[PDB]
Ligand binder design. Structure first.
Ligand SMILES: Nc1ncnc2c1ncn2[C@@H]1O[C@H](COP(=O)(O)OP(=O)(O)O)[C@@H](O)[C@H]1O
Lengths: 526, 533
């Protein structure tokens, strides 16, 4: 027997409609590439998104065609998010800091039919343009620019394309499991293809109070890029709650960020540690209080504890350490305390804020041993982190037969501990660990010693099996030009640079490593 | 082309599993019927829920059979919530304050096969038992009690039935649009048949900051009964967040509630206005500061503005005024500020927290006129309030094809304004609005002015017939403790706050307002009692 409630698909276009309906005047600030600052609002972004969704449809694109972006956090990128997905296309956010050969691969593999880009990346797009066979419209995210048209003959312009859209466009209605957007990971990059369902449930979860939780009273500054992992979902979550937004565009250095916070009264800022280090450096120099800032979200790389202490003690700002990855849309955990934590001594309360955090409803975590078996969640045993839930991927884009999931779970590639309350601690990368009995050994830490040897051009380190220690490191070295180092002096080089028991057991000389389409397939091991 | 994400049904059983995995030691306090206090936790509620779900599966029940409850807010009720819905049955909470004859109607119309009930209602179930012929299991929520076995032959006992369930029961996996739970709302009462998907989506919305947002650090005390729209969703939202809970049991008078707040450190409490009058009344007498209380959710009836002021001014407690209905499972609107409001003068800011609030993502509101056409959302025009969304009902139980919706909207029966910011103001239920002269009078606006008088503890305004004006407002007032206002000064208190012709013509004094089964003023019996003068 089914329930008797209204049923409605969980569509991304319903988020922007809600912001337009009940928060249409709520202010959104957009730092443009030409130095301009746009003052717009959710209502205007919704109208532009609808009109651009019509304009995209009138190009004759097919349902779920990919729409690529190479763009900063700005109002036109926010509009494309809703325009592409809302109209039933796939919003494909591309990282413009990648190497050109990586962009060529991603754009062609995704088969973006449209490529929106910001003016910053005009030389970059012009350079790879002739390798981008499948792209039918190149669109600068601004108005007609004659120098731009010189670099890319045939270029189109956002501010002209949008005027071709019908002003009374109606979002189509489709199955909520329809593909919505696309983000590639760091061999080649692999694309994770989100649905409207997974996006919307992820925003729901992120909008809860113990995860991030956007309020309409917030001024939210996503410094995390919209070009990677959806800016942690904040373009979706801030629409759900009608939060104010400050989109910082290309100027992400410390002085510009501190000025955005103080000029617009940012209450919630989201970034990664390197960007925050620039912000904290400037703030300490100019003596600002960051008066309006209440809390920050830091994810993407391990949040340093002394950064948490700085925000807390200099500024009275709480730091949410959050963890995730492209494959989880991105949010996996967030470090918020539990009730029982108020009764610990204040200093123990501070160290509890340091790990990657606890998972919200909708995501489940476990750690497994090297044969796939569950390990206790005692906070001390280390295992391969496995995840599943409503916004974890099932398979990579154009790669379904590769049996990604293991017993319905996704292997993150991280080694972690998990305590009984699900607080997770990244410890290592599964692919980097050689499981020498007793203490494990990092392969890259051994490589970085080895490649620094002046008589070695390069070298690789692999775990190779051993009858007593299970897995032991082997050094695969290629001698520097005109040099002939002995095995003994290469291993002697490790003396004092690392514990003796981690030194590779044997040296093997190759004249070259066997390359994949760029890196080294050390699965040989043969 | 579909996405390539894991897809899993939105099941109520994943809420309790999540709480057991990651909040398994988070504490839940349960005031029991006998007079005892159980200290348990989500891990324990979940293990008992899993095992009760096994035991109910072994009774032979068929998928989505109704499991009825007549119960207070306590650990066993919470366990049944998850045991029943998790096992694929329909958790049917029944209000034990209805007349026994209404209960017979409801239980037969819903065809409950199992009837869990607290010891408080042993007499009442024994009296109406012979008219509940489709109930196969009467389960006292407690251990074997031979006196109980006396009043009800064949009576089974919760603490015996649960031990029949496997300790390793795996929840079944079924369509998220499967019926999960049923609540009757008031001709005859009608059933609202919720689904697992609607339930989980409503829990997601209630857990946002600007609605309620239960935190793992909250101590949550729902005084709202788990038989009134599932205690406003809180057994689901709290499980989703792993909040601590205080389940108050049978004693909901002010002194009992004050003691629970101070004894267990309640941070967030939720209830209809009348339960907050007793609490605030007693708190003023004993002098408590309600130290742990941070927040309150007050809805079901209009929160008096002076009640909001008291919590804010006297306790530093912020009151979230919220509106909803059984048909919206229940959340419709919640009153939280917008950023713009922080610039306004401080008392325009207090003023904006008085209305019923603004809708969250998942809910849509509009008002329509008597012909059904849209009305401006200008904050002043009045119309019939209409709703649609992910947790709004499509049709009533056993009444699937009866043209309930108007162009896909559900008609709430409330008269309201809606402002351009989406804030909703209840003018009145359609049934209580007063038609005096040629214009409508909001009884709700009138009573809340009267309640604010410092010499009244509470008050109600009702329309009574008048030979010239059709009907006229009557002030039914309750004198505050230590106060003795005259009729005239209560009437003069209205001057300037409302049009002259809207001031009630007369005051009558009563010791208490008659309350219905959800603690709302029974204005119908007030209109009967005072049909003269
Ligand atoms: N904050 C509120 N202010 C005024 N009325 C309210 C409020 N919240 C709920 N209600 C009223 O209660 C109604 C919903 O429930 P009701 O009709 O009393 O039966 P039930 O609560 O069992 O659904 C609403 O339609 C509205 O009339």
């Amino acid at each position: 027997m089914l329930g008797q409630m209204m049923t409605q698909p969980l569509l991304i276009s319903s988020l922007i409609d809600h912001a337009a309906r009940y928060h249409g005047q709520t202010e959104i600030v957009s730092v443009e590439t030409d130095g301009t600052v746009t003052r717009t609002n959710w209502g205007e972004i919704a109208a532009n998104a609808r009109r651009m969704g019509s304009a995209l449809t009138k190009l004759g694109l097919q349902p779920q065609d990919r729409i690529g972006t190479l763009a900063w956090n700005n109002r036109r990128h926010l509009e494309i998010y809703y325009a592409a997905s809302g109209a039933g296309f796939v919003c494909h956010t591309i990282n413009p800091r990648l190497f050109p050969e990586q962009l060529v691969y991603i754009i062609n593999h995704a088969q973006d039919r449209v490529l929106f880009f910001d003016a910053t990346f005009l030389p970059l797009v012009a350079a790879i343009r002739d390798q981008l066979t499948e792209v039918k419209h190149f669109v600068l995210m601004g108005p007609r620019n004659e120098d731009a048209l010189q670099q890319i003959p045939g270029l189109e312009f956002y501010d002209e394309l949008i005027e071709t859209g019908d002003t009374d466009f109606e979002w189509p209605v489709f199955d909520e499991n329809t593909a919505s957007s696309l983000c590639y990971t760091s061999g080649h990059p692999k694309g994770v293809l989100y649905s409207h369902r997974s996006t919307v449930l992820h925003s729901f979860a992120s909008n809860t109070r113990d995860v991030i939780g956007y309020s309409a009273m917030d001024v939210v500054m996503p410094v995390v890029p919209m070009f990677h992992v959806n800016a942690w979902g904040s373009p979706y979550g801030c629409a759900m709650s009608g939060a104010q937004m400050v989109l910082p565009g290309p100027d992400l250095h410390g002085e510009a960020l501190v000025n955005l916070i103080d000029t617009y009264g940012v209450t919630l800022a989201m970034g990664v540690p390197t960007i925050w280090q620039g912000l904290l450096a400037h703030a300490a120099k100019c003596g600002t209080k960051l008066e309006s800032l209440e809390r920050t979200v830091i994810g993407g790389a391990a949040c340093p504890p002394s950064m948490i202490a700085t925000f807390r003690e200099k500024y009275g700002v709480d730091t949410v350490h959050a963890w995730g990855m492209s494959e989880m849309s991105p949010l996996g955990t967030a470090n918020i305390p539990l009730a029982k934590h108020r009764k610990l001594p204040i200093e123990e309360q501070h160290k509890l804020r340091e790990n990657q955090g606890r998972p919200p409803f909708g995501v489940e975590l476990k750690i497994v041993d090297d044969d796939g078996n569950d390990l206790p969640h005692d906070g001390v045993t280390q295992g391969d982190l496995m995840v599943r839930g409503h916004w974890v991927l099932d398979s990579y884009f154009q790669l379904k037969d590769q049996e990604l999931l293991q017993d319905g779970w996704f292997a993150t590639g991280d080694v972690a501990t998990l305590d009984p309350d699900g607080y997770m601690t990244i410890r290592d990368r599964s692919k980097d660990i050689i499981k020498s009995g007793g203490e494990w050994i990092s392969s890259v830490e051994l490589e970085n010693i080895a490649v620094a040897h002046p008589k070695l051009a390069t070298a690789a380190v692999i775990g190779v099996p051993h009858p007593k220690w299970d897995e032991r490191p082997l050094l695969v070295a290629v001698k520097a030009e005109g040099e002939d180092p002995s095995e003994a002096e290469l291993l002697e080089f490790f003396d004092g640079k690392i514990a003796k028991w981690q030194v590779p057991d044997k040296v093997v000389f190759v004249d070259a490593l066997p390359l994949n389409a760029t890196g080294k397939v050390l699965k040989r091991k043969l």
